[model samples]
Target: CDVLVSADWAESNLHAPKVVFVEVDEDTSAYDRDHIAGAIKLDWRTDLQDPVKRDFVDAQQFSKLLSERGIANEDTVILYGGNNNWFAAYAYWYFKLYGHEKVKLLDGGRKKWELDGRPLSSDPVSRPVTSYTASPPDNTIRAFRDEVLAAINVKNLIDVRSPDEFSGKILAPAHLEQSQRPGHIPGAINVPWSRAANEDGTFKSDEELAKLYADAGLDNSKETIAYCRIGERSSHTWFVLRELLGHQNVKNYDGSWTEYGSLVGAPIELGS
Candidate 1:
């Protein structure tokens, strides 16, 4: 009976024991004003990360976070946020990285919820935290700095940044300057992250997504290295490849355009 729940569905089940709602907002003040009743707040930077670590948090650490937050493996976790961008997506990926499959993203996120007149509460709910344990999965979806560098000369390395960024004209992590160079990885194509969704933040259909990939000069036939400012927007592309288009052999350049655009001694492109 479980399906992708809409804001209305979440509204009806706001008090359901089996449903766990998470308000993952970059700005914590939004939660203090009004959140879905029974929703718990998770800070993307602190709560969902293994700070100063190479990759994401380990399984034991993730389990501990969930346990402290009162989430159990069996709870149907529904995630929403202001941007409908990073926070929820990263949290979803993090939990899934630990092998939790029951997680789902709320369509249009909090924007849609408020639009549909769903109830909001300023009060936070408290529940007895339960203990959790997690076992790691293969985790092949991630790509390291070395793996990406090795793929620099390979086919199908796509930069999921704006044409300006891909061209080395608008590199993020502004600390490092990349405008000096004016190109991208040898054969890499440019597919800006916005292409994955429409103006309202709703994902495109699988068929449309397939066309989008194809239109960008990417095919399901090969592996790709998708990246953006800091790997946040890149997660959207990752979700599309793995979950929607069912494409295999795709990697999220976690360090993303920031890292890639740096290391200036290497190859690059601009304005293409």
Candidate 2:
């Protein structure tokens, strides 16, 4: 199957020895509530981040996390989760950052799975722990604040937050605390990541996606940076651009608005 697979593909591969199913989300309770049978949980906030550092877990920690979760270096991993797969895409980016080659995302995520009346299990399935080691971080797929500053005038920047948030009407999502400042980065075009998906949460057709960005003047050959309040939503757009639309130089600005807005002299823009 392609990088984005349907629920049927996931269902049939649920317990395949070479395929591991992972459910990623911000809330751990979602996995405890109900998840696909035999799916392992990866909590984005706690599991992916370093407790002491303000960054992601290092290569050794990532390797150990996968080992403890029954994932191996050669496994074809399928990732799915809540929030229209926001955190799932973040997890997918993490796997890619650490150089896992066969990772795939469950299209439409848990919402579509539930809408289709797919089976859900509250129980967790355990698999034999396997030793796994992650490759060095693939810096090509990730961007840092200094890189973002340099790209301000040289790259196509996409702000994937809602119109209200982009316009400085709100600083963050209602469920989260607000960023100190309200506006987006100076040169960003507000695409709002949800625009790339249909009502059912599945990605829009390739033809549709092409036009959506084409009209926005986002050249596939040009370098592009995407960001949201934090980084998860922007990673969704990163997936759409790099994986789906085949943009060669797309990066996710993980620090996003929180870091940018809080900076001493970072340029900011306001308005629709």
Candidate 3:
């Protein structure tokens, strides 16, 4: 199944049965402030992330949220949010993590939605509740610090953080002083997730994306791992590599620099 749907496609399918549109953002106002007509909203903080921990809630909580929001396992889920489909891609990764089979992102997300001349709304939409079940968690799409350490020069290690962060100018986010050190993992190339996206909120074409990685020394056949200071940004590039560029074995190292940079013996490479 395709991983992205265009704004026009989303507009045509707005009223399509069994299809649900959810707008995801770290900022809840990215919703209550107004959103696409008939779209529901999911705030990453409360709805997706665990209240007491740094990690996302478990499958049961995810299922509970979906069940309450009227998402059945078989329904098609379309996600759109501002910021280069930013948090939308993060949500898409979560869907894939839980093994949801039919989820997609709206290409360019909110910007394109606005630029393409579609209706925006303050009205809220609701669908009758349905019991939702999530599949077993999938780790194949995730990479831990041990894997990151081992990936040194062996895998296609891609750092999607800003050059400053990659070069040790910035500490990881959830930023507490000394919460972590700086610099990127060893043997990784800095591509900056922003490069994969166009200014208009649309992602670049497949041709450009493939070339982007190639020019960075990424080998399509190699197993790949992408990371940023925290994690969400890494998933942006992960989404582009796996979902768009058709990379077969790419994983998101969500632990990223916050974990890697803090480890006592982890190898780091810093630059200006």
Candidate 4:
């Protein structure tokens, strides 16, 4: 019912008419191998990306994607995925970018469901295709590379990468292709995104999250821009700050280290 729902809550709401189960993942095969019953696959790679640009699909394209998926404006779309909901959070950010109010993320994502021994199915469920319209992109929740560059003087910039990655000890994760540079944006504090969740993969409670950010000297008062090697990890932090902690101004820099590190004149810092 909340923005983050548990596996039990999702199971109970599986067949509810207003509820739509969306499986978003980096690997498209994950859904075909096994998925929550009555779930529709939304591949984060091709389905959510723009054809030519290195960005998300435009509003019109987003509208068409949802329309084809039989997702209505008022539907409560619950997104879950592999990789601990990395791409699922990215999809959730995209949904919010297009002004979808009823969107949610499954707590702990696919792994949690599997751990609980929830039944999985390969069967595809189809609903009546409906006309779904998306609003214009909301820049308030998103930031471009230029915006990030301008925010070099801002205090709320967050580098949600691993300590090694943030300290320039590593360019990126082994699974991901490396960026041109191995450091983070100047002035950003390193706060690994994984810290937002518990060992069970579920998010930390509101009090814990509040304390975590507060301990980092990050409050809700400033405009925050979160980034990782790419955008996905940072999206999780953005969700935590914006949705859970109720921050007034937070943006996810989708270009992240990949673009910023590669930029010709972008400022970068190494070591903590």
Q: Indicate whether candidate 3 or candidate 4 has the larger lDDT.
A: 4
Q: In what order do the candidates fall by lDDT, top score first?
A: 4, 2, 3, 1
Residues 1-272 of candidate 3 have per-residue lDDT tens digits of 38888888898888898889999888878688678877898887789888887688789899999999898999999998876677888899999999998898888888888887788888878878889998888999999877788789889999997787778877643444433667877788999898888877888899899888899889776799998766778888999999998888989987777677778977778884
Return whichever of 1 and 3 wins on TM-score: 3
Models 1 onward score TM values of 0.87, 0.96, 0.94, 0.96
How badly does each model clash, as a count of residue pairs? 8, 0, 0, 0
Taken over the whole model, the C-alpha lDDT of each candidate is 0.73, 0.88, 0.84, 0.89
List clashing residue pairs in candidate 1.
167-270, 167-271, 182-269, 182-270, 183-268, 183-269, 183-270, 184-269
Residue pairs with backbone overlap in model 3? none
lDDT for 73 (candidate 2): 97
Better of 2 and 3 by TM-score: 2
Estimate, for each residue in 44-148, the C-alpha lDDT of model 4 and write its tens digit. 888998778888898999999999989999999999998979999999999999999999999999888889999999886787888999999999999998889
Q: What tens-digit string does per-residue lDDT give for candidate 1 at 78-178?
A: 98888765567766766767778688877667777787777789886776797777768445777776788788656467677678767666655344563
Model 2 lDDT on a 0 to 1 scale = 0.88
